[PDB]
Design a binder for this molecule. Structure first.
Ligand SMILES: [Mg+2]
Length: 280
């Protein structure tokens, strides 16, 4: 059995054909779980659930080390609110490649009713495609002022989650350069795709949006059509993103974006199709 900071370990499931993982987390461990806030409450980032699903795809589905890991048709349901230092049990159950993720207070977790649903979707695994993928395009865009973005966003994100080092935009497209630091970079090979690194890619989308719209009632990921992970344990990527055309030119309740992550050398690391954003 392969250790994972969020999934935990396999445990018996009550359903005959289901496979289950449970682990304990807290705002202190993984530490990035204590560094995203909404209205003075510690709120677990939705990228947490995407990493758990990829980690389950790796461990539930046999294959080659270089296989592509896939999560599809993902919906994020309730937020997970942590109280500082108080442990939460996290659970991923899967049957016939469908998964669901729940959390519970550890002392109450014997009752299925104590478990709150956070994410659902499908997992899969495919051999690495030999097809040419494409490269990071030369956008020759306008630099986005990241110091202004970070000052705006400091109410939601602490120091471990300020990992965008450069961002340039042209229309609704942008290229970001994101890099883990400190402990997160140290631990990046424990993850399929470190949540702090994928959050940084998503914040590149936010930074594009917040160059035009208000950052109050901020956009929150609600799901995505597909994520494909082609290399595991990465620490630094350049990300190409594209926002779909918005309903409004002034202020939107929703946005949709596609993203491609490339390693520093230029190979495609991950794809995200139709990330759905909605204002909280
Ligand atoms: Mg989130």
């Amino acid at each position: 059995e392969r250790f994972h900071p969020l999934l935990g370990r396999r445990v018996l499931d009550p359903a005959p054909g289901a496979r289950c993982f449970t682990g304990t987390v807290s705002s202190d461990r993984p530490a990035y779980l204590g560094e995203h806030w909404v209205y003075d409450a510690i709120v677990v980032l939705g990228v947490t659930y995407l990493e758990m699903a990829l980690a389950a795809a790796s461990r539930l589905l046999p294959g080659n080390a270089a296989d592509t890991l896939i999560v599809e048709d993902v919906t994020v349901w309730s937020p997970l609110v942590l109280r500082a230092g108080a442990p939460a049990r996290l659970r991923l159950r899967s049957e016939d490649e469908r998964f669901e993720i729940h959390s519970a207070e550890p002392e109450r977790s014997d009752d299925e009713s104590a478990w709150t649903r956070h994410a659902t979707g499908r997992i899969a695994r495919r051999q690495l495609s030999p097809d040419a993928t494409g490269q990071l395009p030369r956008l020759d865009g306008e630099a986005v002022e990241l110091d202004a973005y970070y000052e705006r966003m400091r109410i939601y994100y602490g120091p471990r989650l300020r990992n965008i080092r450069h961002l340039e935009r042209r229309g609704r497209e942008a290229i970001g350069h994101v890099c883990l630091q400190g402990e997160e970079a140290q631990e990046s090979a424990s993850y399929e795709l470190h949540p702090a690194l994928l959050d940084a890619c998503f914040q590149c989308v936010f930074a594009l949006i917040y160059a035009h719209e208000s950052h109050r009632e901020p956009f929150v990921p609600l799901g995505c059509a597909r994520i494909e992970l082609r290399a595991r344990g990465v620490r630094e990527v350049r990300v190409h993103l594209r926002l779909h055309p918005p309903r409004s030119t002034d202020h939107n309740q929703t946005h949709t974006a596609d993203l491609r992550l490339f390693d520093m050398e230029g190979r495609l690391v991950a794809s995200v199709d139709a990330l759905q954003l909605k204002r909280a």
